[PDB]
Short mmCIF file of C-alpha atoms in Angstrom, two decimals:
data_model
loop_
_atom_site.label_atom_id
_atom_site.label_comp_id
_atom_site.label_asym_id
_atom_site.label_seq_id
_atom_site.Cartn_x
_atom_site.Cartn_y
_atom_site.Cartn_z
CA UNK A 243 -25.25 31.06 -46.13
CA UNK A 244 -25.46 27.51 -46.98
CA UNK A 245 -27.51 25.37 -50.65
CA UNK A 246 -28.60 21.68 -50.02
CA UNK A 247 -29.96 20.46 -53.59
CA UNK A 248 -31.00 16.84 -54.36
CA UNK A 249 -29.16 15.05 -57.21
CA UNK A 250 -30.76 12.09 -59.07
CA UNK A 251 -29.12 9.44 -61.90
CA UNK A 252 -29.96 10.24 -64.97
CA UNK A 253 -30.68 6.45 -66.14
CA UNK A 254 -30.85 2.96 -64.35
CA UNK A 255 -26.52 2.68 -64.60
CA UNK A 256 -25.75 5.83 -63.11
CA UNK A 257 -24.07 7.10 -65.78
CA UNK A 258 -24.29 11.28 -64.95
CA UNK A 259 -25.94 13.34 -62.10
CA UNK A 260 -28.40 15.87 -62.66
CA UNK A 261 -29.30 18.99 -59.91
CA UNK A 262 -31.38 21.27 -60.30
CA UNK A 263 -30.70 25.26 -61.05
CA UNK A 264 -32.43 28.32 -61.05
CA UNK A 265 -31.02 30.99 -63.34
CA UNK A 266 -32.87 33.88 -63.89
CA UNK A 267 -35.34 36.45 -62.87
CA UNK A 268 -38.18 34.94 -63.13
CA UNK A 269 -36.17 32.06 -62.25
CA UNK A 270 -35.41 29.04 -65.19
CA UNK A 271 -34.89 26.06 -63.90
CA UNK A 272 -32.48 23.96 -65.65
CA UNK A 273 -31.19 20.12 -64.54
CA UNK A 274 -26.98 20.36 -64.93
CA UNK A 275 -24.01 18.10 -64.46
CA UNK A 276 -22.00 19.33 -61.66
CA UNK A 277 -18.60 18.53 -62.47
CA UNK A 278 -15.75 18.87 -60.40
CA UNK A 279 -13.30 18.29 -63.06
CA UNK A 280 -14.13 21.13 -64.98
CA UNK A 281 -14.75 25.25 -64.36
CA UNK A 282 -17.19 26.55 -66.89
CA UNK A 283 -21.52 26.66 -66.08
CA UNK A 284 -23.31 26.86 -69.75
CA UNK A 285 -26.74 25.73 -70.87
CA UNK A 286 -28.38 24.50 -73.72
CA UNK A 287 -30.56 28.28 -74.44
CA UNK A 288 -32.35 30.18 -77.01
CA UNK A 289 -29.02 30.56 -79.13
CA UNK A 290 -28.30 26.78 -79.39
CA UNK A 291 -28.24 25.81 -83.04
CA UNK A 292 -31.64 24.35 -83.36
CA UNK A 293 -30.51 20.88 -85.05
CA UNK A 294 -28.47 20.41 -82.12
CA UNK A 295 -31.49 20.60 -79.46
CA UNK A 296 -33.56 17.44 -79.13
CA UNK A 297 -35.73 17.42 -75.72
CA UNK A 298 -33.31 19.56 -73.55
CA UNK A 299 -34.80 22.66 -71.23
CA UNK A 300 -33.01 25.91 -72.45
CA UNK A 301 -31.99 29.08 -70.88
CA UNK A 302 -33.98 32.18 -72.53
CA UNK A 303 -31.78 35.14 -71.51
CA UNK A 304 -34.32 37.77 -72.61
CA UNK A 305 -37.07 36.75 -70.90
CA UNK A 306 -34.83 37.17 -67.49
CA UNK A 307 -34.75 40.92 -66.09
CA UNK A 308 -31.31 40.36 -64.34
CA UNK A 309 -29.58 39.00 -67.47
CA UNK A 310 -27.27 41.09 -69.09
CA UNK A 311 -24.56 40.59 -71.87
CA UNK A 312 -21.35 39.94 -70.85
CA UNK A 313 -19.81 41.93 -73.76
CA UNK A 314 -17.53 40.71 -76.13
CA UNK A 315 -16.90 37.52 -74.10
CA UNK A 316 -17.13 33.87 -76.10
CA UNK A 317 -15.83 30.05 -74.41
CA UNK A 318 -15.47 27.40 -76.37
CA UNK A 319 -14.60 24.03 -74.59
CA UNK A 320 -13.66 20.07 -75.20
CA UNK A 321 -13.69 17.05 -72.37
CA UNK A 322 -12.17 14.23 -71.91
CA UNK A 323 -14.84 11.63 -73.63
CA UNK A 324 -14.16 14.20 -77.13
CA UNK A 325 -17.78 16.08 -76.23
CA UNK A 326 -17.48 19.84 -77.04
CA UNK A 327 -19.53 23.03 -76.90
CA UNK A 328 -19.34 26.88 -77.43
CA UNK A 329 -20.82 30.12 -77.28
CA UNK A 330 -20.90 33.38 -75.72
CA UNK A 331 -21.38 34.53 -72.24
CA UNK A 332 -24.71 36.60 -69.86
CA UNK A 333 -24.15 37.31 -66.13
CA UNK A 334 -27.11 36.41 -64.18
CA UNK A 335 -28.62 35.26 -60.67
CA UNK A 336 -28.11 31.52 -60.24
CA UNK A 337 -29.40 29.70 -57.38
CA UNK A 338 -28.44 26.25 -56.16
CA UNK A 339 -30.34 24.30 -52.99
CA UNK A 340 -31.53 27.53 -52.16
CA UNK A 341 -27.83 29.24 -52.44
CA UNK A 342 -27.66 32.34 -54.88
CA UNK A 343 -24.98 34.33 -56.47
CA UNK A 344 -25.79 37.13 -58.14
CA UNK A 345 -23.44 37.73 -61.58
CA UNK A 346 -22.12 34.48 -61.86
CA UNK A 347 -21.29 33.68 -65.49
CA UNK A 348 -23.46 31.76 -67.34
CA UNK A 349 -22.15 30.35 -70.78
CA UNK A 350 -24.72 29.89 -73.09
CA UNK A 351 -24.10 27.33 -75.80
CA UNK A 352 -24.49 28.28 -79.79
CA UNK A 353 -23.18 24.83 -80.68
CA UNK A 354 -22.99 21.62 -78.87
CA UNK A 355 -21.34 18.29 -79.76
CA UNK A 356 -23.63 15.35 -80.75
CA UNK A 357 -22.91 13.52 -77.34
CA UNK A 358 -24.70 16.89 -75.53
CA UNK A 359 -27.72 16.95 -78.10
CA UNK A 360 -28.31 12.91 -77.66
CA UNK A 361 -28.80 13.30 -74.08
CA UNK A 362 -32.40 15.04 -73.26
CA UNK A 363 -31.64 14.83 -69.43
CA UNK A 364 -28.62 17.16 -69.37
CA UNK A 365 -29.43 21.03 -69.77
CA UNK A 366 -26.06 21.98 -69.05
CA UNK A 367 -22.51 21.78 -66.79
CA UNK A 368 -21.54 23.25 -63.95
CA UNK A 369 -18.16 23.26 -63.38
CA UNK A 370 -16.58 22.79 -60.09
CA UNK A 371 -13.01 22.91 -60.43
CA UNK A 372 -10.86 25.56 -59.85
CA UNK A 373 -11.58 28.61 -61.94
CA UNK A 374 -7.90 28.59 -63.49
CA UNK A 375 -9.82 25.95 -66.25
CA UNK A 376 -12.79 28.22 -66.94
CA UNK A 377 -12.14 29.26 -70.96
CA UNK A 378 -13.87 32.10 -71.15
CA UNK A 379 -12.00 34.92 -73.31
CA UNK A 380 -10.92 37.50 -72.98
CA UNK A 381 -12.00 37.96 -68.99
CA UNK A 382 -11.48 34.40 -67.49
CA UNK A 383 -14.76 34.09 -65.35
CA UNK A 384 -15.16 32.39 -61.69
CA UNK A 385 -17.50 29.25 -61.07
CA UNK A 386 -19.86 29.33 -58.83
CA UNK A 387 -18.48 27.83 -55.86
CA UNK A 388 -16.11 30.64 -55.99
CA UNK A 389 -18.30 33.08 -56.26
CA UNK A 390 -20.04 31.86 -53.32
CA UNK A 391 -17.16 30.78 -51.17
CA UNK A 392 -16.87 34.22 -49.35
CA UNK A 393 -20.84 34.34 -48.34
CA UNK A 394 -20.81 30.77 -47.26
CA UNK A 395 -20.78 29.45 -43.68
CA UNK A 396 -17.26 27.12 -44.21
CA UNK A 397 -15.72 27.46 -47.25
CA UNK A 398 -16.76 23.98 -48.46
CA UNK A 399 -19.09 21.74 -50.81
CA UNK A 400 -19.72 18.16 -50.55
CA UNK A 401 -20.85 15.42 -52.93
CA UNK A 402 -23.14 12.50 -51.79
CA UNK A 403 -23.78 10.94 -54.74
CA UNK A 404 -26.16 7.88 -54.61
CA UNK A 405 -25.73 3.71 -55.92
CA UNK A 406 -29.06 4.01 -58.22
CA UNK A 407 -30.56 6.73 -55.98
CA UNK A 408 -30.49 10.03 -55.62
CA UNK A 409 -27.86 11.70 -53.21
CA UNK A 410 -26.98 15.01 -52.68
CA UNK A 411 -24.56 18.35 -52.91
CA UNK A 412 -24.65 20.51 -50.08
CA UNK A 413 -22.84 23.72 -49.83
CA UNK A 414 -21.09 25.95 -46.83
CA UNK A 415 -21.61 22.93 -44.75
CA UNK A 416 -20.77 19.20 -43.57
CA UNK A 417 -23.77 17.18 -42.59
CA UNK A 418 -22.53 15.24 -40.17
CA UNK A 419 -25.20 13.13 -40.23
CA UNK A 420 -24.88 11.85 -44.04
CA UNK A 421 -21.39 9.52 -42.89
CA UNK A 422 -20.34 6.71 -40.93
CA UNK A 423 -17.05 7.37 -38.99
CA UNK A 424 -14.88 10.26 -39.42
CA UNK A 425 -13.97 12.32 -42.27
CA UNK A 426 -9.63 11.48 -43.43
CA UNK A 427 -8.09 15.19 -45.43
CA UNK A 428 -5.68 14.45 -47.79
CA UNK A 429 -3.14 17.09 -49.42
CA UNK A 430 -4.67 18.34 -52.98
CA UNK A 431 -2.39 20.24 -55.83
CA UNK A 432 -4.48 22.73 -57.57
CA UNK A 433 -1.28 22.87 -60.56
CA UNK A 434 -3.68 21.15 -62.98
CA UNK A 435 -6.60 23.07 -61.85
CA UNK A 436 -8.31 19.87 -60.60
CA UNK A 437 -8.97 18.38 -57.01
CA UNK A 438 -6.29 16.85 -57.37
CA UNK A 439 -5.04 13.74 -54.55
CA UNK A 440 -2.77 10.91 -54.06
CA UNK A 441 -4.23 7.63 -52.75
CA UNK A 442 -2.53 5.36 -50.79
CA UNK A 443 -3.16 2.20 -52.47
CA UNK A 444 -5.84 -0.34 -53.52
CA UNK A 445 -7.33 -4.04 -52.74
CA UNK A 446 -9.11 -6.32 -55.04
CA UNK A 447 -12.19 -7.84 -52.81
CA UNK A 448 -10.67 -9.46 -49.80
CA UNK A 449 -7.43 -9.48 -50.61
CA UNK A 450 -4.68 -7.69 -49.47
CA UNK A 451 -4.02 -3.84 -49.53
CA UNK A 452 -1.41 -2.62 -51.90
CA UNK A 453 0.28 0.31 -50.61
CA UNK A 454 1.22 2.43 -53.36
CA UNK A 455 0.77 6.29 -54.58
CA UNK A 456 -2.07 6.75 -57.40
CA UNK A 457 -2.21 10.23 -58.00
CA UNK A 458 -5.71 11.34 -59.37
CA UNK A 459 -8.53 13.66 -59.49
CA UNK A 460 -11.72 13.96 -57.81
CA UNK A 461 -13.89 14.30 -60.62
CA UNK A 462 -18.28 14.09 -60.65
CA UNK A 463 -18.46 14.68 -64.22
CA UNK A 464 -16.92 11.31 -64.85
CA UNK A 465 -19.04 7.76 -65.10
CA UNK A 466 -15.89 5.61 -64.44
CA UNK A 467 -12.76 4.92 -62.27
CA UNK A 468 -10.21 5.38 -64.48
CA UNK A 469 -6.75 3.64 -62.69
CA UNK A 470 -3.11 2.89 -64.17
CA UNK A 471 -3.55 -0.82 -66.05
CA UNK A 472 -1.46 -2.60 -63.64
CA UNK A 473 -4.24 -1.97 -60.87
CA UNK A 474 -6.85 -2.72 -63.64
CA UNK A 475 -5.49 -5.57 -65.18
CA UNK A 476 -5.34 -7.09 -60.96
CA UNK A 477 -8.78 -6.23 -60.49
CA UNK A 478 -10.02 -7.95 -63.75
CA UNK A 479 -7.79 -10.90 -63.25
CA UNK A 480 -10.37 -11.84 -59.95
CA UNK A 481 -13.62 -12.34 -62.32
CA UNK A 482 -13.91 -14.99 -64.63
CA UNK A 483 -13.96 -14.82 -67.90
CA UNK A 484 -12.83 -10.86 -68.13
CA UNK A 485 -11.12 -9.17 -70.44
CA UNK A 486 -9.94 -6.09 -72.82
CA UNK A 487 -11.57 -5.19 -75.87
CA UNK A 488 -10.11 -3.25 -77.89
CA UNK A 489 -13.05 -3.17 -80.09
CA UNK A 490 -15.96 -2.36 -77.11
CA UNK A 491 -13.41 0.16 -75.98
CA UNK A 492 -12.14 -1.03 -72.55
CA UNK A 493 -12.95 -4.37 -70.52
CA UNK A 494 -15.75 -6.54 -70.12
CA UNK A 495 -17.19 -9.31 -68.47
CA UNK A 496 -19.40 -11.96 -68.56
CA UNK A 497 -22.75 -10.24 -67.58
CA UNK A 498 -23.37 -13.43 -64.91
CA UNK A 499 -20.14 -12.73 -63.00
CA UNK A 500 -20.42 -11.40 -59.38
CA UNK A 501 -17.38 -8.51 -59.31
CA UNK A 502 -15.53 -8.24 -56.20
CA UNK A 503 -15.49 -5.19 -54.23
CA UNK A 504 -12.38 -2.46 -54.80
CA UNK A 505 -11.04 -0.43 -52.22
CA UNK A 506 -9.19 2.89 -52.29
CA UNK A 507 -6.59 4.43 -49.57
CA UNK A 508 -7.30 7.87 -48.35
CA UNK A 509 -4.36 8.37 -45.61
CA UNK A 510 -4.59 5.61 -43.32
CA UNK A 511 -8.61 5.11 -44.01
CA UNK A 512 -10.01 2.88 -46.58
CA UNK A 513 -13.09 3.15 -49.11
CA UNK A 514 -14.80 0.07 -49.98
CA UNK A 515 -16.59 -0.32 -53.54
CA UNK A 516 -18.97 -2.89 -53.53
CA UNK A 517 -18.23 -5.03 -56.96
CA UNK A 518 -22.12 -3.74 -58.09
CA UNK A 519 -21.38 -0.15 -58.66
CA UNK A 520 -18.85 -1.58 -61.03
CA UNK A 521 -21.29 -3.23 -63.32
CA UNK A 522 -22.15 -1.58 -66.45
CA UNK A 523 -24.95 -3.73 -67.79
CA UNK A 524 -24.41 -5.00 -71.24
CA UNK A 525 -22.46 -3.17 -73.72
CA UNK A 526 -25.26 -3.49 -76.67
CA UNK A 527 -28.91 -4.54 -75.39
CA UNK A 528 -29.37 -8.02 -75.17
CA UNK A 529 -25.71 -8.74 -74.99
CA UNK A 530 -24.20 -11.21 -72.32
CA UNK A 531 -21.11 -9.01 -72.16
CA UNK A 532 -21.25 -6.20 -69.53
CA UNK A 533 -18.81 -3.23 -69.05
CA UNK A 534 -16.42 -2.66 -66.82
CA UNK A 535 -16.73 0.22 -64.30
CA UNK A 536 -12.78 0.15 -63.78
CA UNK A 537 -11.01 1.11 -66.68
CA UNK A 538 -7.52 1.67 -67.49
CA UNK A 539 -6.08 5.52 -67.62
CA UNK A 540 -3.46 4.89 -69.55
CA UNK A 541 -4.63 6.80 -72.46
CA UNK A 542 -5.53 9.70 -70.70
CA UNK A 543 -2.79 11.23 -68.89
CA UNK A 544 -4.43 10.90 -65.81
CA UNK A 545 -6.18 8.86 -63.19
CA UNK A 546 -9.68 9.85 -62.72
CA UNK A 547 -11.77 9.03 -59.34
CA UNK A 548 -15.77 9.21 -60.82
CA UNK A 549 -18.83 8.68 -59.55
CA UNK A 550 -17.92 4.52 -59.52
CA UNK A 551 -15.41 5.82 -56.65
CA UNK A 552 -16.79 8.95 -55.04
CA UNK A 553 -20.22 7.52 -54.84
CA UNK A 554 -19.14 4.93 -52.60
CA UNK A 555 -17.73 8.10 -50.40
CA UNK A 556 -19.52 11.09 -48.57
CA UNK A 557 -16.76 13.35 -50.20
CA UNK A 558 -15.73 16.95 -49.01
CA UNK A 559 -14.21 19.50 -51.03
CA UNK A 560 -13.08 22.20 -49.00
CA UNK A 561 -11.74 25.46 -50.72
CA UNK A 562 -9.74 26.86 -47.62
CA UNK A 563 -6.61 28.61 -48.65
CA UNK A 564 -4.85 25.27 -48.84
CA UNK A 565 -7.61 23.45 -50.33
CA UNK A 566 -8.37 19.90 -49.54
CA UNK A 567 -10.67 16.93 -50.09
CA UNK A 568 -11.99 14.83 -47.47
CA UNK A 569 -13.42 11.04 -47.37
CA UNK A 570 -15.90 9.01 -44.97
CA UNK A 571 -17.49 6.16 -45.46
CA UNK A 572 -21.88 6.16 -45.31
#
């Protein structure tokens, strides 16, 4: 078997993904973040607190005939950005591009975090890491790419995400005709539970490549490129008029600057950011300053590769035994 399912910006900056998701019998359609750097699928639903809904789509387990209690289970989980949810836990059919699994685990949310009830695009997550993160309790559940790894053609998904367009996440399959070139594998460690890599190095615009290790993570539920702030402060350094704010929360730039490109190493291949994707837009409306889309990691224990990164990449995530991620250019 194989899913193909459109995903489309959820505002003019790019700043999440949304895909669409049946869950359900009838089916409920639901737009969710897929997220690669996480391992739980909930939704906003019927048992969401109702102060904490404002404009989201919700799942209604009892109108679906295939829903059915997963008993005793609860999750309860926190991100990165400080956004949290919770609740307990139905099995149902879910179906993605056409893709379905039958009793995958569907979280549904009793409370949500103000950052989840502020945004009316985003019904929900679904997770994408490796199920080793999932938090459900007592019975750790599996996401849905694992639950659909065994059915599909090549045990694979791949994220096409699109520069203020929509792109797309395909599953069981690599569309060879959605790159340029060829497609450089590099090693992942699955010890963290994330798609985890080591790039070769960087280059600010048209100067020379750096060779150096980053170690990161492939991760679609993150805006930003989040790199150590030696890299950072180099990149900054090339635009005029840059700097950190401590009070804004990372760096800016004069809204009239035009940002050089970045470029990552995968192996011996190269990614190219154009210095657009990095733009922000201003950090209050009407301001001249803009924000940065490369921002330091350094206090967050990791380096993350987001969408600024992986939607300058036709990116493939392949869940072999050894898993690995793959690169090309488009």
């Amino acid at each position: 078997s194989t899913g193909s399912a459109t995903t489309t910006p959820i505002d003019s900056l790019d700043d999440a993904y949304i895909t669409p998701v049946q869950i359900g019998t009838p089916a409920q359609t639901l737009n969710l973040d897929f997220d690669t750097g996480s391992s739980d699928l909930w939704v906003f639903s019927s048992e969401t607190t109702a102060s904490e809904v404002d404009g989201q789509t919700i799942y209604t387990p009892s109108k679906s005939t295939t829903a059915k209690l997963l008993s005793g289970a609860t999750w309860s989980i926190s991100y990165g950005d400080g956004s949290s949810s919770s609740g307990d836990v139905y099995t149902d059919t879910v179906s993605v591009g056409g893709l379905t699994v039958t009793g995958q685990a569907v979280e549904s949310a009793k409370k949500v975090s103000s950052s989840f009830t502020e945004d009316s695009t985003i019904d929900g997550l679904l997770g994408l890491a490796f199920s080793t993160l999932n938090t459900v309790s007592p019975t750790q559940q599996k996401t849905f790419f694992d639950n659909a790894k065994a059915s599909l053609d090549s045990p694979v998904f791949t994220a096409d995400l699109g520069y203020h367009a929509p792109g797309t996440y395909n599953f069981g399959f690599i569309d060879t005709t959605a790159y340029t070139g060829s497609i450089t594998y590099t090693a992942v460690s699955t010890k963290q539970g994330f798609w985890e890599w080591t790039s070769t190095g960087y280059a600010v615009g048209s100067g020379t490549f750096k060779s150096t290790s980053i170690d990161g993570i492939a991760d679609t539920g993150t805006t930003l490129l989040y790199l150590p702030a030696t890299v950072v402060s180099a990149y900054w350094a090339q635009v005029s008029g840059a700097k950190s704010s401590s009070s804004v929360g990372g760096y800016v730039f004069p809204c009239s600057a035009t940002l050089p490109s970045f470029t990552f190493g995968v192996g011996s291949a190269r990614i190219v950011i154009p210095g657009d994707y990095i733009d922000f837009g201003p950090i209050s409306t009407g301001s001249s300053s803009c924000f940065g889309g490369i921002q330091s990691s350094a206090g967050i224990g990791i380096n993350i590769f987001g969408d600024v990164a992986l939607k300058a990449a036709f990116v493939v995530f392949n869940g072999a035994t050894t898993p690995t991620l793959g690169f090309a250019s488009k």
